[PDB]
Amino acid sequence: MPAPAEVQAATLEKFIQGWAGWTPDGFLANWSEDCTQKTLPFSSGVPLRTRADTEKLFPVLMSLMSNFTLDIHNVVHDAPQGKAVIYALTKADTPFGPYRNEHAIFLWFNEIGDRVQKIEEMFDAVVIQEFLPKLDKYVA
Amino acid sequence: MPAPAEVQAATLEKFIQGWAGWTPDGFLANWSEDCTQKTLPFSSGVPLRTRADTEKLFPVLMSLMSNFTLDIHNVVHDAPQGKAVIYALTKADTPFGPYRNEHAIFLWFNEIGDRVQKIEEMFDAVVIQEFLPKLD
Numbered sequence: 001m002p003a004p005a006e007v008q009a010a011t012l013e014k015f016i017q018g019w020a021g022w023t024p025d026g027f028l029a030n031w032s033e034d035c036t037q038k039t040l041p042f043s044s045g046v047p048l049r050t051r052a053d054t055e056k057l058f059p060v061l062m063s064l065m066s067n068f069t070l071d072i073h074n075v076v077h078d079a080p081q082g083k084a085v086i087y088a089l090t091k092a093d094t095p096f097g098p099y100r101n102e103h104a105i106f107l108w109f110n111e112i113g114d115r116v117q118k119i120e121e122m123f124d125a126v127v128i129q130e131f132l133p134k135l136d137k138y139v140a
Numbered sequence: 141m142p143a144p145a146e147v148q149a150a151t152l153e154k155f156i157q158g159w160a161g162w163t164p165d166g167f168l169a170n171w172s173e174d175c176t177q178k179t180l181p182f183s184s185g186v187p188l189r190t191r192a193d194t195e196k197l198f199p200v201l202m203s204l205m206s207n208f209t210l211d212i213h214n215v216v217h218d219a220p221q222g223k224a225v226i227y228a229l230t231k232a233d234t235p236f237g238p239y240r241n242e243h244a245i246f247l248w249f250n251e252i253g254d255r256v257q258k259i260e261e262m263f264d265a266v267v268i269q270e271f272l273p274k275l276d
């Protein structure tokens with residue numbers, strides 16, 4: 001069975017606050033140790049990211065985006081299924097100009113309800129898929 | 141104050157059936173009179189579609205895509221808020237070959253709970269954003 005609705009809702013709130021706080025350890029504190037992220041659409045074939053993969057990504061990214069803002073546009077919470085969706089808009093400044101993105105992010109809670117266990121995320125993945133490998137993989 | 145969960149759930153199911161049926165009348169049966177569709181992300185600036193816009197548009201669009209199949213990957217229903225999200229994968233055939241799309245569809249039910257009153261949809265919008273304008 002899913003966790004109590006009230007706990008799931010609190011975890012959804014904390015997940016958003018950890019995202020808004022724009023620190024690696026603050027945001028990932030709300031991910032379970034086994035949590036995965038999957039970029040949507042499936043047709044893009046972007047490989048699943050483990051928690052470890054996201055731990056390598058988020059430091060250099062979050063550093064590159066200054067004045068990060070997170071605006072929550074829609075939250076849909078299905079407590080009987082232990083699932084939720086957020087629609088969010090993000091903005092930041094970068095050395096190359098302003099950054100904007102929007103995210104339809106599907107969440108599943110763990111059984112206790114105090115972590116997110118699975119993430120599927122429809123968003124513009126160009127920075128992750130195209131930019132980071134250049135300034136990260138090849139340079140190092 | 142939203143309708144009972146089972147009333148909303150019946151409308152959600154009807155909405156999905158009307159989509160899967162791939163007919164304009166069947167799909168629009170579950171729209172409220174004032175229901176609008178809005179393409180996401182907002183940054184794309186794709187204009188809202190009214191119910192009337194959709195009545196005009198969907199006959200030609202569904203005629204272009206044959207053998208339409210709808211795969212429901214995820215449904216998230218928030219009965220206390222009268223909201224739901226569907227993630228769906230669509231497949232069809234066209235003369236230019238096979239067709240695929242994927243949709244994160246956000247739904248709001250009307251207060252009575254028997255219709256969808258608002259839709260915001262993140263999907264690959266190239267047909268409505270590139271094709272139709274060029275066509276006109």
Ligand SMILES: COC(=O)c1c(O)c(C)cc(O)c1C(=O)c1c(O)cccc1O
Binds near residue numbers: 243263267268
């Ligand atoms: C005729 O299309 C619909 O019935 C339709 C639809 O029912 C839903 C629920 C979402 C859509 O985005 C569309 C659509 O407009 C569409 C499509 O499904 C495929 C390609 C281009 C499109 O514009």
